[PDB]
């Protein structure tokens, strides 16, 4: 049982403090509050809603590949912007 504000704070801290792009699975496993999702689709919907809410507040999230040798996309927040 984690409040939504705490979940969003954990997500933004994890994105800011990580210098490399993180895929959805790593965020689900690591960041607290995403481990109680009954199904993968429910987690994806919740993460999309949270990301949309954060983007609405003006936080400049950047999406790109995890690595030049990998195809999965990741998330990262630029510290300069």
């Amino acid at each position: 049982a984690v409040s939504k504000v705490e979940r969003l704070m954990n997500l933004v801290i994890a994105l800011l403090s990580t210098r490399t792009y993180l895929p959805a699975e790593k965020i689900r496993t690591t960041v607290a509050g995403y481990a109680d999702s009954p199904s993968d689709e429910a987690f994806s919907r919740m993460f999309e809603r949270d990301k949309n809410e954060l983007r609405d507040l003006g936080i400049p999230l950047e999406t790109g590949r995890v690595s030049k040798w990998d195809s999965t996309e990741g998330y990262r927040i630029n510290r300069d912007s």
Binding site: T20, S67, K68, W69, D70
Partner: protein, 73 residues
């Protein structure tokens, strides 16, 4: 022979290090060196390499390269 440098020769050794592009991250050559003392980096210039003409002993740092480690437990 020792005193007057009769049988004296000069030997030149070449040391090379490369910072290639890795899958898990990018390698950058700089004088960060997170875990050392302060006296070790006396001879290094602003770009993390030794200065020309600076004597180097055994174990001294020539080029300081830091590579990403990745997520480890």
């Amino acid at each position: 022979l020792v005193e007057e440098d009769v049988l004296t020769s000069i030997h030149i050794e070449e040391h090379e290090i490369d910072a290639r592009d890795t899958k898990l991250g990018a390698e950058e050559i700089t004088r960060d060196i997170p875990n050392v003392s302060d006296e070790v980096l006396a001879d290094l210039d602003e770009r993390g390499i030794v200065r020309i003409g600076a004597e180097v002993r055994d174990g001294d740092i020539l080029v300081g390269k830091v590579t990403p480690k990745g997520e480890t437990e």
